[PDB]
Amino acid sequence: NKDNLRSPICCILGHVRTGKTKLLDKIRQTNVQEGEAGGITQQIGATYFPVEAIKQKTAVVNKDGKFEFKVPGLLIIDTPGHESFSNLRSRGSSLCNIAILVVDIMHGLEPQTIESLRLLRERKTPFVVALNKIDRLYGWKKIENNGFRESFALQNKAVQNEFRNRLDQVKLQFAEQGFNSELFYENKNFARYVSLVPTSAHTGEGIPDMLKLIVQLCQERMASSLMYLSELQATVLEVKAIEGFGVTIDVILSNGILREGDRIVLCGLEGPIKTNIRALLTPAPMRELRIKGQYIHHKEVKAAQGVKISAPGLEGAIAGSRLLVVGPDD
């Protein structure tokens, strides 16, 4: 049914300083990356992208306009690239229906790329690879926010030669790791072979191709079930004190529908916590949940979304705990 439609979850994974947060910043038109403490990503980030915005940002690679969008929206998960946060990467990976694996085209596959590849392989998660930082190709000239193929056609042959050498050795690296990969238009076996999207976080080039590709991951590679809403699933990302709201929880609503006044149960230090959802909040669209700002009050939220819950007795709450809704009787 057209209602009960579900927004899938996409996880961005990659080696440290590969441009994950920067790519998200370019799509969002924000500056989270500069703001980050320690100059690193240390927490899971949630941004919701309405399908309209995706249509906007994919216009250059879909100018006839006959490409089909059957998703209501897409929830996007940013993850830490550092070696230390294996656990956060694992959690994010557990949550996400599809993925973008970011590779620095200059460096190729690196240890955390390998780790992420194991994570994706183990949970059989459909993914595309973003060859980021293509502007670092010597003598690259920019057309802002343009499809990769269009701008690549305009490049000189030094740039094309460097690009195809790096592309070749990245393909050989993937082959060594047990993956057959292809440049996204060159791929004839979408099910078995991984599409590669050259991108620039600074220039925004290749991003429309990437967006349209994760969309096609949702429509073709992802299970049909997850196109539609189902029995509720939610996971606690964070526990924090917010003023006017006391101790609140940042939660990923993976499936189902969350409602205001719902009696919920989640896990705390020494045991279960049963309470009622007094306030159901989201960040503004195209904005991170962890980043503070304004909130939108909801009387219900449909999966998948990043939400903030205000409720009594959430002090003990544990991150990574599942969240359940308790029905009125028996």
Ligand X SMILES: Nc1nc2c(ncn2[C@@H]2O[C@H](COP(=O)(O)OP(=O)(O)OP(O)(O)=S)[C@@H](O)[C@H]2O)c(=O)[nH]1
For ligand X, give the closer residue by CB, 110 or 262: 110
> For tokens 């370019």, what's the residue?
26
Minimum distance from CB of 260 to ligand X (Å)? 34
Least Å distance, CB 288 to Mg ion, is 11
Pick from ligand X, Mg ion, none: which does 202 bind, CB < 5 to 8 A by kind? ligand X
Tokens matching residue 14? 């990659």
Under 8 Å between Cβ of 132 and 23: yes
Q: Using the rule CB under 5 A, is 146 a contact of Mg ion? A: no
**Contacts with Mg ion in 311-330 (CB under 5 A)?**
none
3-state SS class at 118: helix
Q: Which residues bind ligand X (CB under 6 A)?
A: 14, 16-22, 33, 40-41, 80-82, 132-133, 135-136, 200-202
Query: 43: phi > 0 → left, psi -120 to 50 → alpha, else beta; which?
Result: beta
User: Does 290 sit near Mg ion (CB under 5 A)?
Assistant: no
Residue 73's binding partner out of ligand X, Mg ion, none, with CB under 5 to 8 Å set by partner kind: none
DSSP 12-70: EEESTTSSHHHHHHHHHT--HHHH-GGGS--S-EEEEEEHHHHHHHTGGG-SS------
Q: Cis (ω within 30 of 0) for the bond into 304?
A: yes
Q: Candidates 1-9, 34-42, 56-64, 163-171 — which segment interacts with Mg ion by CB under 5 A?
A: 34-42
Q: Which helix (H) or strand (E) holds 213?
A: helix 207-216
- Tell the smallest beta-carbon distance from residue 51 to ligand X (Å): 25
Please report whether residue 254 would count as binding Mg ion according to CB under 5 A. no
Does the footprint of Mg ion cover residue 41 (CB under 5 A)? yes
Q: CB of 12: closest distance to ligand X in angstroms?
A: 8
Positions in the binding site for Mg ion (CB under 5 A): 20-21, 41
